[PDB]
Scaffold this active site. Sequence first.
Site, PDB file in Angstrom:
ATOM      1  N   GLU A 198       0.765  -1.221   0.000  1.00  0.00           N
ATOM      2  CA  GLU A 198       0.000   0.000   0.000  1.00  0.00           C
ATOM      3  C   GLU A 198       0.809   1.292   0.000  1.00  0.00           C
ATOM      4  O   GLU A 198       0.329   2.292  -0.491  1.00  0.00           O
ATOM      5  CB  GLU A 198      -0.968  -0.002   1.197  1.00  0.00           C
ATOM      6  CG  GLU A 198      -1.998  -1.133   1.116  1.00  0.00           C
ATOM      7  CD  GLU A 198      -3.081  -1.007   0.054  1.00  0.00           C
ATOM      8  OE1 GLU A 198      -3.108   0.127  -0.599  1.00  0.00           O
ATOM      9  OE2 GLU A 198      -3.844  -1.897  -0.186  1.00  0.00           O
ATOM     10  N   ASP A 235      -6.363   6.473  -5.246  1.00  0.00           N
ATOM     11  CA  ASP A 235      -5.822   5.129  -5.372  1.00  0.00           C
ATOM     12  C   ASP A 235      -5.733   4.670  -6.842  1.00  0.00           C
ATOM     13  O   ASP A 235      -5.954   5.447  -7.747  1.00  0.00           O
ATOM     14  CB  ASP A 235      -6.505   4.139  -4.415  1.00  0.00           C
ATOM     15  CG  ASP A 235      -7.883   3.680  -4.816  1.00  0.00           C
ATOM     16  OD1 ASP A 235      -8.322   4.161  -5.932  1.00  0.00           O
ATOM     17  OD2 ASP A 235      -8.519   2.897  -4.162  1.00  0.00           O
ATOM     18  N   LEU A 293      -9.150   3.786   2.370  1.00  0.00           N
ATOM     19  CA  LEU A 293     -10.111   4.326   1.428  1.00  0.00           C
ATOM     20  C   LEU A 293     -10.990   5.357   2.120  1.00  0.00           C
ATOM     21  O   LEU A 293     -11.511   5.133   3.171  1.00  0.00           O
ATOM     22  CB  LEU A 293     -10.973   3.224   0.797  1.00  0.00           C
ATOM     23  CG  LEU A 293     -12.191   3.819   0.090  1.00  0.00           C
ATOM     24  CD1 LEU A 293     -11.740   4.571  -1.141  1.00  0.00           C
ATOM     25  CD2 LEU A 293     -13.106   2.722  -0.390  1.00  0.00           C
ATOM     26  N   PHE A 327      -8.313  -6.698   2.722  1.00  0.00           N
ATOM     27  CA  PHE A 327      -8.037  -5.296   2.969  1.00  0.00           C
ATOM     28  C   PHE A 327      -8.164  -4.496   1.696  1.00  0.00           C
ATOM     29  O   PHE A 327      -8.643  -3.413   1.651  1.00  0.00           O
ATOM     30  CB  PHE A 327      -6.576  -5.245   3.403  1.00  0.00           C
ATOM     31  CG  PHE A 327      -6.122  -3.866   3.825  1.00  0.00           C
ATOM     32  CD1 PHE A 327      -5.680  -2.948   2.875  1.00  0.00           C
ATOM     33  CD2 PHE A 327      -6.024  -3.521   5.176  1.00  0.00           C
ATOM     34  CE1 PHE A 327      -5.192  -1.698   3.288  1.00  0.00           C
ATOM     35  CE2 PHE A 327      -5.550  -2.283   5.607  1.00  0.00           C
ATOM     36  CZ  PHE A 327      -5.151  -1.356   4.642  1.00  0.00           C
ATOM     37  N   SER A 343     -11.675 -20.253  -6.260  1.00  0.00           N
ATOM     38  CA  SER A 343     -10.339 -20.183  -5.689  1.00  0.00           C
ATOM     39  C   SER A 343     -10.342 -20.562  -4.220  1.00  0.00           C
ATOM     40  O   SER A 343      -9.447 -21.220  -3.716  1.00  0.00           O
ATOM     41  CB  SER A 343      -9.826 -18.768  -5.775  1.00  0.00           C
ATOM     42  OG  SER A 343      -9.831 -18.399  -7.121  1.00  0.00           O
ATOM     43  N   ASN A 400      -6.275 -20.185 -10.894  1.00  0.00           N
ATOM     44  CA  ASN A 400      -7.612 -19.626 -10.871  1.00  0.00           C
ATOM     45  C   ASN A 400      -7.583 -18.184 -10.344  1.00  0.00           C
ATOM     46  O   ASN A 400      -8.276 -17.315 -10.825  1.00  0.00           O
ATOM     47  CB  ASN A 400      -8.553 -20.493  -9.993  1.00  0.00           C
ATOM     48  CG  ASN A 400      -9.985 -20.051 -10.057  1.00  0.00           C
ATOM     49  OD1 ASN A 400     -10.491 -19.288  -9.209  1.00  0.00           O
ATOM     50  ND2 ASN A 400     -10.647 -20.422 -11.137  1.00  0.00           N
TER      51      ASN A 400
END
Length: 164
Positions: A11, A20, A32, A104, A117, A132
């Site tokens: 990040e 972002d 966010l 996250f 998955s 996948n």
Amino acid sequence: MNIFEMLRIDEGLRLKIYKDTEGYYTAGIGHLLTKSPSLNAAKSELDKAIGRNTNGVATKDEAEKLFNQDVDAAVRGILRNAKLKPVYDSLDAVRRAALINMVFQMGETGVAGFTNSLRMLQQKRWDEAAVNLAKSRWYNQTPNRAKRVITTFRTGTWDAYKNL
Ligand SMILES: [Cl-]
Ligand SMILES: [Cl-]
């Protein structure tokens, strides 16, 4: 290596409000703020999150505090999600951090959507799950990051993050 360090690498850290990868107002360590196109709406969310008139700028300590809250919430969201919990419980410590990272970044809902998955991860079919996982918008939009997370699921080690 641990979840905090891992996410801090993925990040980054920016003290001023920024946009972002999807063009949304964010601040600190991937916190966010809003999907609204309005900077003021963003400034407003930042002040409400920190508890003071920030003028769109946080201090390092404030950012780190938001980050701790966000990691905590991600874990708790996982534990409360009927589709995520069972997967998380079946995984080893390193792989768990991989799942936290995805949550996250994309939200519990987004991740719970990777049905196939998740089943593969639960079954411990590593290579298959990796293949996948890669057939997704997530991988096509943020490939370097997605590769790091995927390698982590594949190998169960922190190899993709050592160097960073
Ligand atoms: Cl908050
Ligand atoms: Cl990326």
